[PDB]
């Protein structure tokens, strides 16, 4: 993840120009071998064109480029490239959606299971460690960064997401599938033997934190759905059949004709094709979105930091359920315990942003006294 | 369901171009029989012009061939193709996530409905059976593939979806609509003897359940909705005479006529139109990617395979109530017990995806002392 | 409804092809009135031009054809159409969604309210009928169809939906207003006297009861909703607006002109202008898509079948509430008691579709023994 | 709000060109002052061009025309208007849904709220009450036609909508915003007090009766975020330039020049620029789409009817929570009490839509005996 | 936030016309910089073509001119434009969608958590200044304004969100990573407290304070996932790279070459070349749009009111839950107590708004007696 959004806060002079200077993530990084290859082939194609064909040769590669040329449409292109890369940066959200957060389970954790004895702080360990537990398998299916930190389930076990009881009990259980679903049934094992055993007082909180658990369930499982129904391979294709046609036929049709043979749109020989540059800048530039966002949990620069989201998650779980239990600070009287309007302070670097509050777009509209009385 | 998420999972030099070597669920698969089609026949209307036609038939085909390819401009193919494989796309993917998943639902049941008798077993394994014979009841409907697995409801019963009992009670109560709703009233109704029987304990779990199955009632319902509710018929049709008359022209107006004639644009005889071939795949495979996810319960390569997604949760919803009910590994501490800080520890091929932590993007803005005062 | 999906199941040759040769909900069904009309306006414009204008007049409009020609544009009445279609295909879905299906609540009423004698068994069918009733109420509101079927409610009275009964307390309670949320504030009150009188044992069974019954009430609004509040109608008249000029301008700037006067475009002089009516076929066809879907409660062949939506709603519901309450078959070990790992068969038809599950993208990376060493 | 769903029931012949003979809502409405200002603005440089220059001066202006005609485009108008015109209606709709009706919260204040005394009847009316208050304090502020029906919280309190001591406890709880969140909190304190007082039989009650509340108060919330957050300025600017920025260069570049000097394009000099004239009709009347529905609750034809939705609530609220409580019609067994397959009748207008039903695409699927058998 | 609804209420005679004479918000204010450079730029270029060059160079210029104007319509500025600020405005509004409002929170709080005494009272503030501190702790980290506001947890505690046993607990909790997910947990614990207390009489009541806060949390979580996960930079450089070509093309191609020359389409100078500039506004403000609102918590005229939302929501929580708590108005029929029919009046200004009901489409549908007779 490439994050930039403190150099665009406000819209200043030339804002987005500034990104231009970046490398990591950028589209430089993303299209140099592509463009690279691009210009040698379009330089032989010239070099073959002007030192190596005959005048009737030339002749014929003349009409060859004016009949590519008559070819090189923009609206299609453009048009499948937008669909497609919408349809990429819409599953990439909503992949990212789908990335577990253990916090509404970790307060509820926190709070509805009891005992500050040994009994109940390695309860709540455990359940928080069954949901991380979780997490991490459905990530080191799908993540390629995490299964490289985790390429086994024992390490796994040398990480301490699992115990070796728990590593036993999964291999025990083995199915012919992915086996990222187990800690979920052992969280409502586990959270039914909490409240049997006097833990949880109340089956409301119960149902509350089975709650929480299978809405983790399911983001785990939509991520397990985005990383198996890929984007159909046919729509995948049919773009870059798109871009790369677009660009074989550019790679003739815009080669710069003799200018001695006066024909139109070939009066000014600049070697250099800079507007076909630029479409393949733009152009494959958008394909790159796509190809870079269609797997966000590859190893790419603005791909998904899944092994900091994996580390915080577990920190802050066991923090949560463990140190944090029942542990509040002292409740005493606030600032405005006898002001019924409170008005934090701004700073100097702040006091433009004290603005009245909107009152409603009908507030200002000026009635007369005739106009105002009740029929 | 062809999965290629590991090629593209970076970026990296032409990842989309590899992709192009694939055959299974590409666009030469689902392409080369209209493709064979249309080379027999611009190949057939090229020798009919140069070897069956006298001068004045060629020159008036000529006058239609340079008419075609000026008015093949007309044909919107792109605007249409757009949103309507737009359309498909949102359809296809709405209808992978009404596919009915029991995980929620088998981890309450194996955790509500206590008993590790002969009785609670038996319970458990008959809710869970009754979800996964709704689901398999509306994907007999709607999924080619598992109609041709099952047939008849008595191959659900040899295949073990069904009981005799379920098979005569379903046979009983047959109406004349689909009978895919009966496994919920049957899940309601033994949640609620199981409540009322002592084996849910509070009528909060009881909810859970049920809530969890109207869920997977709710998924099935929009499942035969989209099979029932298809795409207007009309716009379907717009777009493939769009496609189809763009290249019926194409059999024209792309020919190569005669170099000798000197016409703008046909000075060269390059017998191959290779930029035709090259919109024939681009704008047909945009075609082919809404013809193959227009129904996407098939048995097309990137349908989906609901087959093994049926086998997948029986298995798995009969092992987590059955096998996994109050069946938990030994609780013990963890490697963090007395660590308040837990580290886990990076491999040598993943050391380099070990970032600090994102604190928002003012972290790093700097103020002095004077505008840091209230 | 027109349902075609069996005929797409798999991406055959030409399987879009085949769905051109059908008539019901048809491009041609909804197209062919309007073809005959500017076809003949068409050919009068053209029998005028070639037999009733002198050679002055001719010259004239053949100018005039050039110019109409020159002003024919397909990017604006394109964008327009596709936004317009987009957002009717989008209500329309929406409106889809909104169709009340009691079978959550079907299921809530047949497990949770108790009862095998009459009373209980009236009480179950009651409240059903309440749901179905309201149900019915908006549709014969939003529907013709269902309007048609039932033009008063006396004719839901003789249906079976309505007792006389009801209609007279729906008569006793009549606001200048659509009565269609009466039934549901008659499920709350009879909801809550079961609950009192102990046919409904927990006040939780009676809250999901409502719930349900609270969802089935938003799809109605929403139906409502989509009645009344139509797409707006200087949407509509600008797309009208954008076609219908679109080909005014063609029936008199795709004229044939005459060849022997060698203008740009019109060497070849053909009679039946194919491409001008394969255009009227494309933009026409995406105009008649929005036309019929912009109600589909009207009458068309792919507009929803509300009756029998209505029928069999009405028939499951009372089956599942009245006959299988408590009616379950008898529970008895399945064919896969003792086998840990269920293999149901597949026939010879089926065989093919047996696959080896996805363990995950990542499962076949390959790494080294020293790189998956933990550091 | 215009309706016309009645008249696009059906795709019949022309089902949207006679909607084009419409004129309360229409496009002809919001465009003949711009269109008569572009017409007379477009004959007053016809004019000069042709009667007040000098032929040195005259070929200055046709060179300027040729010249603008150039920089006339149609894709980036088309492109902003749609995307603008896309994000206005989705807006619009979402503005629409987020309309709060009391009627899930009115069925559960009906029900859960106990007694037929007037300790009872008083409290469900004031509840419901402080519920229409909530929704009518939000609508004054974010809808100038109730505004302009209560100008001030005193018109509220002669409208019946605030009782005096409503009023005063308002003016008591003052602060420098809105306070049309105060309805909310008195119907979470009024609630609590009734279930206090056993008015509210169990906790679970007053939980359903707090959630409607809540999705209520989020929909107002809503309201007014769409009030306040309007679509960025910048943007609704760019919109504006594009079209006007197009139509004051069509006022020069589209003008007839002397066909005299046989211009390419101005060989014909038809005075009025009927397919000019049409573009404007049609982007403008686009653009008016957005500029009706950007703020769809000011005082056009097709903004939403707050006022009668005022109403609606206020009636129908009061008589589901005070007249229809425990109000129900004899429960007797319907038509279809020992029938197992009920059959409500079609009338002859609607015997067409008997419909078998849908039992699958997959039901016609014809497998031979081979290969059928399990292997 | 520039709010200009009650301008756009009625589709009236040139109603977006009068917004192009705004400055706060405003194309102009975004984008007068980038015009002056523009200006200069092609002046510049324009000075150097006529007073600086020989006729050697004026024909290799005008040339080049010629080349520039045939081939800028290769960049397709407008489709890569439309989609990016289409993406732009609907995660703009999502990030509108995740600001934790703590209405229905505050509504729980002041309901369910009984006692007028100083115990209850107490404790019901100090569960909303939880909720409060938690949205504010992340709108410090995703807003620039808010941070600008409070630039330490020191001045939280001066501000009143956050106790100094608050912050120095806030301290010893301290981990690596961002903490404001720290009060949720808090608010958790001090509910399942106060219903241990009796303060808060069934556990339904808790569930639903305990829904609200993490609902509340989802928010904030949200908010702090779009200031971390950006719009990839490489869609951003793709768009800013079209803008920016395109302009510094048009410096070259849009010059009024010399009307000596007779070139076709340049034949008559106009010194200021108003259709491009009219594009540069168009675009450049389109570009803008996304530029504006690519962080809506920044400083810009359109971006949120972050400051203002925090400081409302601590007066107007803290309002309802100490204040409002058990403090209802008298309990009085009200004025259709006994009308069957309420009928509330239309004033002058309203009475055009008195519209009959809509019964539905099907109503008007007119059917004779033959077909509306039942089919034995
Ligand atoms: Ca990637
Ligand atoms: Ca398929
Ligand atoms: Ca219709
Ligand atoms: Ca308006
Ligand atoms: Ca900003």
Redesign the interface.
């Known amino acids: 993840?490439?994050?930039?959004?403190?150099q665009?806060?406000?819209?200043r002079?030339?804002?987005?120009?500034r990104?231009?200077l970046?490398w990591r993530?950028?589209?430089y990084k993303?299209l140099y071998?592509?463009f690279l290859i691009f210009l040698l082939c379009y330089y032989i194609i010239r070099f073959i064109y002007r030192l190596a064909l005959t005048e009737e040769q030339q002749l014929?590669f003349e009409?060859?480029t004016?009949?590519?040329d008559?070819?090189i449409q923009?609206?299609?292109i453009?048009?499948?490239?937008?669909?497609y890369?919408?349809?990429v940066?819409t599953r990439w959200?909503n992949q990212?959606?789908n990335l577990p957060?253990p916090?509404?389970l970790?307060?509820?954790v926190?709070?509805?299971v009891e005992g500050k004895d040994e009994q109940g702080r390695?309860?709540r360990?455990?359940l928080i460690?069954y949901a991380n537990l979780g997490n991490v398998l459905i990530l080191?299916?799908?993540?390629?960064?995490?299964?490289?930190?985790?390429?086994?389930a024992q390490?796994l076990v040398?990480?301490?997401?699992m115990?070796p009881?728990?590593h036993?009990?999964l291999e025990k259980?083995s199915?012919?599938?992915?086996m990222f679903?187990?800690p979920?049934?052992?969280?409502?094992?586990?959270?039914?033997?909490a409240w049997?055993g006097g833990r949880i007082?109340?089956?409301?909180?119960?149902?509350?934190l089975?709650?929480?658990?299978?809405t983790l369930?399911?983001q785990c499982?939509h991520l397990?759905?985005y990383?198996?129904?890929?984007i159909?391979?046919?729509?995948?294709?049919?773009?870059?059949?798109?871009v790369?046609?677009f660009f074989?036929?550019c790679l003739v049709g815009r080669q710069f004709l003799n200018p001695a043979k006066a024909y139109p749109?070939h009066?000014?020989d600049?070697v250099v094709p800079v507007?076909?540059f630029?479409?393949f800048?733009?152009?494959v530039?958008?394909?790159?979105?796509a190809?870079?966002?269609?797997?966000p949990?590859?190893?790419?620069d603005?791909?998904?930091?899944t092994?900091?989201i994996?580390?915080?998650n577990?920190?802050?779980s066991?923090?949560?359920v463990d140190?944090?239990?029942?542990?509040?600070?002292?409740?005493?009287?606030?600032?405005?315990?006898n002001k019924?309007?409170?008005?934090?302070?701004?700073?100097?670097?702040?006091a433009q942003?004290?603005?009245?509050?909107?009152?409603?777009?009908?507030?200002?509209?000026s009635?007369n006294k005739?106009?105002?009385?009740?029929?």
């Open positions: 993840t490439i994050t930039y959004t403190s665009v806060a406000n819209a002079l030339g804002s987005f120009s990104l231009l970046c993530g950028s589209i993303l071998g592509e014929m009409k060859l004016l009949y590519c008559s070819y923009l609206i299609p453009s048009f499948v490239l937008g669909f890369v919408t349809l940066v959200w990212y959606e957060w916090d509404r970790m307060s509820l926190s709070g509805f390695l309860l360990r455990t460690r080191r299916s799908v993540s390629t960064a995490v299964y490289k930190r985790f390429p086994s390490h040398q990480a301490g997401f115990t009881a728990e036993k009990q259980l199915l012919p599938h992915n679903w187990v979920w049934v052992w969280f409502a094992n586990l959270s039914m033997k049997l007082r109340d089956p409301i909180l119960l149902q509350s089975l709650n929480e658990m299978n369930r399911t499982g397990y759905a990383d198996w129904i890929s159909p391979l046919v729509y995948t294709q049919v773009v870059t059949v798109a790369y046609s074989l036929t749109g009066e000014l600049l507007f076909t630029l479409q800048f733009f152009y530039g958008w394909l790159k979105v190809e870079q966002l269609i797997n949990f590859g190893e790419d603005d791909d998904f930091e092994n900091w994996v580390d915080r577990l920190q802050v066991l923090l949560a140190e944090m239990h029942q542990d509040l600070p002292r409740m005493e009287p606030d600032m405005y315990w019924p309007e409170p008005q934090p302070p701004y700073t100097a670097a702040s942003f004290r603005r009245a509050s909107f009152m409603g777009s009908t507030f200002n509209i009635l005739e106009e105002m009385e009740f029929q």
